[PDB]
């Protein structure tokens with residue numbers, strides 16, 4: 201079992217939870233709750249750059265979201281059939297990462313900038329990101345983003361579609377193929393399981409969860 | 420067939436690609452975005468997936484996103500390790516590199532009232548977090564390269580960053596002998612030595 205070291209929160213570990221679950225991989229979690237928990241991880245040499253996320257997997261102690269995700273996707277054949285498909289996957293998911301990052305950091309936005317930043321995220325979703333992925337899907341008409349088979353790109357995108365829905369459910373309304381992809385991926389047995397109550401899937405981060413993490417870093 | 424790099428005539432988010440291609444001895448062309456109307460043509464022509472540069476035309480693709488570009492180039496030219504686990508170490512290393520790189524990249528854009536405090540935090544992380552981390556990797560095996568005893572993208576990305584740290588503060592590397600030794604070795608590899616010489620596609624600091 202892979203062991204995920206993070207707070208009991210989405211943050212920078214949630215995409216890994218999604219990917220592992222989608223891949224049908226059982227995993228364990230060790231939740232950081234105190235500064236002492238982080239002290240131990242840091243002191244035991246568990247964190248290369250003294251940060252989490254960190255995943256213990258196949259004898260490695262992997263930090264950096266992308267190192268973790270790239271390893272898991274390759275292992276479970278969700279990173280395409282070759283270098284060219286991996287390139288398309290990388291391009292798609294890094295756009296997904298860019299949008300993901302804006303939403304992720306939204307609750308730490310300066311209050312006086314919050315209105316404008318939300319308006320910008322929504323604008324970008326409407327005009328930049330959703331059209332881009334809608335375009336890819338219409339280009340080949342296939343059930344999956346790349347190579348006509350399930351890959352990390354479908355998983356990463358659909359995870360993001362759930363977050364966009366949380367933000368504003370109307371944003372996906374003019375994108376039928378994204379909606380269709382959301383439905384298809386959500387019905388894959390592993391993902392259907394992950395979306396159901398009782399799975400390691402984390403709730404939206406509230407102020408309390410945010411502050412507990414800050415206190416743990418003693419910021 | 421020759422890769423074409425679409426970006427401003429500047430380092431920015433394209434410089435690490437220029438470094439990697441040059442290090443791999445791969446000939447490329449650049450098309451410089453000189454104005455807002457240049458960028459709009461690329462967008463309107465459907466050249467940019469997310470309406471952003473960098474973009475590299477390579478092997479029938481219009482690859483946007485720095486990491487997609489670099490990941491493809493590294494694999495194509497055997498600078499991405501031999502197996503899944505070596506790629507994991509490489510990714511871990513270069514993502515730490517990309518994090519520090521990002522702080523230095525954005526420092527000129529930092530609001531003037533926050534500039535001094537941002538710089539102090541960057542220097543503190545270099546001396547206490549990042550440099551020790553890579554010094555440790557080098558010391559762990561005593562080999563000339565970060566991964567697999569063989570030139571990889573990790574060496575190229577790190578040494579590029581060492582150059583930027585030097586520009587920022589030449590004293591920062593002083594207590595890390597192995598990083599100093601890596602910088603020297605990589606800078607003297609034929610392809611990289613040529614890239615560091617005048618008249619190469621290597622770009623200057625922003626003025």
Ligand SMILES: CCCCCCSC[C@H](NC(=O)CC[C@H]([NH3+])C(=O)O)C(=O)NCC(=O)O
Pocket residue numbers: 211212250251252253263264265266304305307308410417514518
């Ligand atoms: C609501 C805001 C969400 C912000 C996410 C914070 S994740 C915690 C943070 N880790 C990172 O920023 C790691 C980033 C790294 N690039 C990665 O992707 O793994 C940390 O350990 N920080 C401690 C430190 O840097 O000292």
Ligand SMILES: CCCCCCSC[C@H](NC(=O)CC[C@H]([NH3+])C(=O)O)C(=O)NCC(=O)O
Pocket residue numbers: 294298431432470471472473483484485486524525527528
């Ligand atoms: C001082 C140097 C700081 C970096 C300069 C910005 S690079 C230009 C910018 N590109 C990006 O932000 C691409 C980011 C993307 N995540 C990547 O890695 O390629 C752009 O095309 N912007 C246009 C847009 O987003 O519409």
